[PDB]
Design a protein around this ligand. Structure first.
Ligand SMILES: Cc1ncc(Cn2c(C)c(CCOP(=O)(O)OP(=O)(O)O)sc2=O)c(N)n1
Ligand SMILES: Cc1ncc(Cn2c(C)c(CCOP(=O)(O)OP(=O)(O)O)sc2=O)c(N)n1
Ligand SMILES: Cc1ncc(Cn2c(C)c(CCOP(=O)(O)OP(=O)(O)O)sc2=O)c(N)n1
Ligand SMILES: [Ca+2]
Ligand SMILES: [Ca+2]
Ligand SMILES: [Ca+2]
Ligand SMILES: [Ca+2]
Ligand SMILES: [Ca+2]
Ligand SMILES: [Ca+2]
Ligand SMILES: [Ca+2]
Ligand SMILES: [Ca+2]
Ligand SMILES: [Ca+2]
Ligand SMILES: [Mg+2]
Ligand SMILES: [Mg+2]
Lengths: 524, 524, 524
């Protein structure tokens, strides 16, 4: 067999059936004779390719396979890889290299020092030393992406490798099963369970790896047994808990002092599936108040190492959440009471308050909708106003890198065809990966895109005011017609200048058979 | 003085007055109190920011300064940096970092291992160890970008650094003059001059560093004195010679065998300002035929080292071209005869042949127009059909990375306001950096964008046929309305479905007062 | 508190009480006011510093702390780090940096791009962005070294940092407990246990991470229950099993074909604590014969990913070995029969056969002796001839890098003062880290060094013969007087030219109160 045939057999045997790509000449010898049981999803720029694949991987809870063109294509995708690193997204990024005979002269399209290009944003990065090594290197890539802590990996392959003969002993790669589904040993787990049972006022903080593991329901049981309030760790990439469950307390503010103040009086704080903590704003103070002990369960040694406080356990989130939820005692304390609904912001017949938009989406969207957020000044309100009952219902750029949500919402929708995806994206954010719209049109992936148009980089204006920073350039983005951009890429387009039009547009979008973009005029 | 004030004084004293950027929160403490004598040029995605800056630097023949947001913004720009490396573009790429107090916990927006992120695509990459070092590190960045061989550099700065006190001894940085304007010592230069004078059938090959150095006129004199044909080195990023001068012989094919065949019978081949050689296609054979000696003058040790044949001299291209042009004898051989005009391709009243488009542009464009090429299947015809008399008249993505020409054409036009820029961009290529159009609209930078719409990745289809590669996915890009995209970003839009409409559209565009996009329907 | 006081409190609170070092000026502000409860162990070159620390860490089963001088000191230690990476040795390597005010000018002793220097041989490498971050970065270093898979880490600290004020909130670092003591979830563990119980002819292969985890006794129980032969994985850095236990079958040959042939007929092969596999010689063939299934338990995702065959489980070796040993059924098969003793090689009254040396050591050494091997041509015979009943009884350079055993034997002896350490080192190997002898003398660490003097790089001569490679230079090392070298560094020295003298010398050495070197004349 050839390296090409062996490699595609490895991919299929390891459950991969989709290639997210933007092709080039170094990749044509890989993409030729494309197997009939695989699907190719084209996107028009590599940030879009990787964003789509990322949303697909995150929602599918399985690795996604990518093929990019050499150094320039890889480079175009590196902002998307910054997010994928922070979300632990299991992405297998492949890129074609020049033919081995012309690497030394650095012919056009040579990826120089290729393995160093995507560092430090990948778990493993490699170029094989021979063609017959390619299947083995692909095996390594699959497993490195997929083992906890999951993350992106990179493999560069000289284009002449594919047609060469494979090692027949590569068959041993096909069915390898690699597990990291591990939990704390019984003796130490029993210590932890006793500390939880003995706590007088426990709190739980959950991060994105809970949702990645589909540990949400186990965390509900854990919270119910401990009678404990539940927060989402700051800068949240995913939603790990039902947002109208009585224990839910919302998104933590991303500040040192604010978090220690919130946790004051909680004697044991159990963090699961989050870094400790993804702070953002400068908010100096105490990491924890006297009287609070923190225990973190994390899938990532890097998280455990860098936590400034608390004990940690490095283990699989799914395995630990299940064990804890089934081992703790039922506390006799009263169950926490549900947070009240948010207030209705006064809304005239003009431009929409973001609060109005989120309330209307919550009113009209199906109960199993999936939301993406890249409306950076409105995150707090979004988290308060959307009832997200189910796992896999929320995504936000995990490194804060704009250009994620538009393509990722297409990947999520591809992963979950029965669940209506609604991406809420600011007018600034929408441009970074605007060309991703075309993939939704071409493959008829019926994502709804809600563009929050207030004409400015509103989160940055806000911050400039907290800095009392005057004369900052570049904060306004006037003059973008998002209906015209959607037309440009073949997506049905609507406008909402007031609440009546927003409801009419959403009704239309929800019943459409293809992707739809709604440009909403929001208060500046 | 603060680090902020000292740094902006350094920049101004070193001739920098423009910041190309997409802002973020780690950058607001740099961008605040933005000096009134500086200009900020906003673009909506970082590939666009860097492409614009690159075109500006290349055309202006001076460094361009960039400010990007942390890791995600830097990452979005890395495909643009792949091109900038290959063009030797002097780009000072800065990115904001988290406040030093929160780097260790890896707060959101921390650029982890920052200096490694843009490697291997930068000449120098650094994060200073203290705030007071920032001006000095900025000085290093300026000079590293600007010394031969020019290229991109990267500097990451924690946002809390700007307000700190600077070292008063940083004043010594302000007026430093750093020169690499060097040429071969007189004894060895005289040897080279004698070898050129003694050659019986010399040839000259010129690359992009000739145009970067504005050595074009000196190379004309050199060619005239030696009575030598002149070729452009393959995969050409720039045009180093008047294309209708009698010695001009065009773009070399990017193949090993093809180049040695072309040079057969030339006893001395003098290469100036190019790698030896930027081959592309697999075309195995002899690097040189018996009887040909090659001598390369290069500004880049990396080029000199990797050449598979020939002698080399590492020196400044401007200094060497001037010296050679003034020292060689006037040969008594006859001057080469000019190449004949290209043939007129038969054209009906339907979709446009690319040859027709280039002939019409050549007919109608001003004699000092500047062209950019990202119409990848039509490069050979473009090079044959445009009379480019002047330096700085052509740019093509130097690493082959799409997404260069659309933004770079805006930067070139900003650099050369009196010279009409015309970017000829395929429908596939146009999407990579489509949002760059907005910068042209907002700043009223009157670039003309000619979209060659044949609905496919035509260069890739072509190559798939040379491979006899069947079943390759992802090669078609139907369903893009470029007039709607231009409307989306505020740029005047025209369509050309036949030659009559192309001439009408070009007449309109050339007289417009702002940027214009023309969607041309080209033969598939 | 200062950064210095906070950092030493962190170290003590995390169990560190010893600094292995070679000092320099960038380190004096760290080493001043050296706490009275810490010990400093000086060695005369950094390969020796790190080797000593490595042996100490490996035998103590806890992290070892190192302080080296800037780039040059770090560099001198990088061959030692190659071994430490392969042995998963938990080493915290610190190096002093120039004062932050002079890093930018690259004053003498500046460690340029410091974190990249020890890559790729460290798990984590870092230089903090501020003085107050240093304790936190030290915390990260401790935990990164100590979490499975253990390994070396690197931290560079500007010398002016130590005297600065620490963050009072660094107290939260002091008592952090970080666990990776995890095992496969119960459902999947039960599947594995059933596969082991159902096997008709299981085999066990053990690697060094078994001995690191002190899982040896659990592996004995596992083997006894399964009635399974036990092999040591090839290129063994440690001894994971009693070598005269009836199930023991010795060191596997480090070849692909040889291993599959050895495992032929074994239906399930359980590998614990080893890479799959650390082959050495080129011995192409089948990774496994038909009928053999392989299951690997590894503490290292990198091992799991790169195995060319088999399933894998990534978990703590101690936790998995205990669980398996207590869960499998007692098989009714007969216990394997012990291997017979090795043959006595004929020995005249002249130069010693290595087999004679190992038999005599086995005869005379205490039953709880610890051996180190850097006698590269005699490894197979050593493994056959030493009865090593206890854990922690064998060390061999895990990357094959010479210069390990001499210093490591001093560290092992420091770690295990009641267990006589005997390092068996070839005459070639002895030179790499010869100066380590001085540390044994100065601290009166009573290691016995047995130099196997045959005047040649015997393993290389052997290989040159398997290659039929003629005219290979540099394979002989005549003219070294090891008794004089030992005198030079203050270590008692003996010679053994025949067996009578070897026994007399060993008797003397075993009763000595300090370190002793015995130069043995071995057959060439
Ligand atoms: C790739 C990238 N570039 C720049 C930024 C900086 N940035 C920018 C530019 C923001 C404004 C986003 O504006 P928007 O219109 O999408 O939303 P709001 O008006 O609600 O803030 S939020 C922010 O962090 C970023 N995070 N990622
Ligand atoms: C960033 C990037 N991605 C992918 C490619 C691969 N690629 C692609 C996708 C090409 C087709 C460009 O199509 P076009 O419509 O712009 O022009 P033609 O139809 O004339 O080829 S040419 C080529 O090298 C690339 N070079 N750069
Ligand atoms: C640091 C380093 N340098 C060089 C070698 C190469 N090498 C060398 C030089 C060997 C000969 C060791 O000779 P010896 O006298 O210690 O033992 P033998 O005579 O028993 O082989 S074994 C081997 O792999 C190495 N492994 N490590
Ligand atoms: Ca409602
Ligand atoms: Ca699905
Ligand atoms: Ca906005
Ligand atoms: Ca004409
Ligand atoms: Ca100008
Ligand atoms: Ca095209
Ligand atoms: Ca005996
Ligand atoms: Ca001890
Ligand atoms: Ca020897
Ligand atoms: Mg990189
Ligand atoms: Mg290194």
């Amino acid at each position: 067999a050839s390296v090409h045939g062996t490699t595609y057999e490895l991919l299929r045997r390891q459950g991969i059936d989709t290639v997210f790509g933007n092709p080039g000449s170094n990749e044509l010898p890989f993409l030729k004779d494309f197997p009939e049981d695989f699907r190719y999803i084209l996107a028009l720029q590599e940030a879009c390719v990787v964003g789509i694949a990322d949303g697909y991987a995150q929602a599918s809870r399985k690795p996604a396979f990518i093929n990019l063109h050499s150094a320039a294509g890889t480079g175009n995708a590196m902002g998307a890889l910054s997010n994928a690193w922070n979300s632990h997204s299991p992405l297998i990024v492949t890129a074609g290299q020049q033919t081995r005979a012309m690497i030394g002269v650095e012919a056009l399209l040579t990826n120089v020092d290729a393995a160093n290009l995507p560092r430090p944003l990948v778990k493993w990065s490699y170029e094989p030393a021979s063609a017959a090594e390619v299947p083995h290197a692909m095996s390594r890539a699959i497993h490195m992406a997929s083992m906890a802590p999951q993350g992106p990996v990179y493999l560069s392959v000289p284009y002449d490798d594919w047609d060469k003969d494979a090692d027949p002993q590569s068959h041993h790669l096909f069915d390898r099963h690699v597990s990291s589904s591990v939990r704390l040993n019984d003796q130490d787990l029993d210590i932890l369970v006793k500390a939880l049972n003995s706590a007088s006022n426990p709190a739980i903080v959950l991060g994105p790896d809970v949702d990645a593991a589909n540990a949400n329901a186990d965390c509900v049981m854990l919270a119910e047994r401990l009678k404990a309030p539940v927060w989402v760790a700051p800068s949240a990439p995913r939603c790990p808990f039902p947002t109208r469950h009585p224990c839910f307390r919302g998104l933590m503010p991303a500040g040192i002092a604010a978090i220690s103040q919130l946790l004051e009086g909680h004697d044991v704080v159990l963090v699961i599936g989050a870094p400790v903590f993804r702070y953002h704003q400068y908010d100096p103070g105490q990491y924890l108040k006297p009287g609070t002990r923190l225990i973190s369960v994390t899938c990532d040694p890097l998280e455990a190492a860098r936590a400034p406080m608390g004990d940690a356990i490095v283990a699989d989130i799914g395995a630990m959440a299940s064990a804890l939820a089934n081992l703790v005692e039922e506390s006799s304390r009263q169950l926490p009471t549900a947070a009240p609904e948010p207030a209705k912001v006064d809304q005239d017949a003009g431009r929409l308050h973001p609060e109005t938009v989120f309330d209307t989406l919550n009113d009209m969207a199906p109960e199993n909708a999936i939301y993406l957020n890249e409306s950076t000044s409105t995150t707090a309100q979004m988290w308060q106003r959307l009832n997200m009952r189910n796992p896999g219902s929320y995504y936000f750029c995990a490194a804060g890198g704009l250009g994620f949500a538009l393509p990722a919402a297409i990947g999520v929708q591809l992963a979950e065809p029965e669940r209506q995806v609604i991406a809420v994206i600011g007018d600034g954010s929408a441009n970074y990966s605007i060309s991703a719209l075309w993939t939704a049109a071409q493959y008829n992936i019926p994502t709804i895109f809600v563009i929050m148009n207030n004409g400015t980089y509103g989160a940055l204006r806000w911050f400039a005011g907290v800095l009392e920073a005057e004369n900052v350039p570049g904060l306004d983005v006037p003059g973008i017609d998002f209906r015209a951009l959607a037309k440009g890429y073949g997506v049905q387009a609507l406008k909402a200048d007031n609440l009546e039009q927003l409801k009419g547009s959403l009704q239309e979008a929800l019943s459409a058979k293809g992707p739809v973009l709604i440009e909403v005029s929001t208060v500046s």
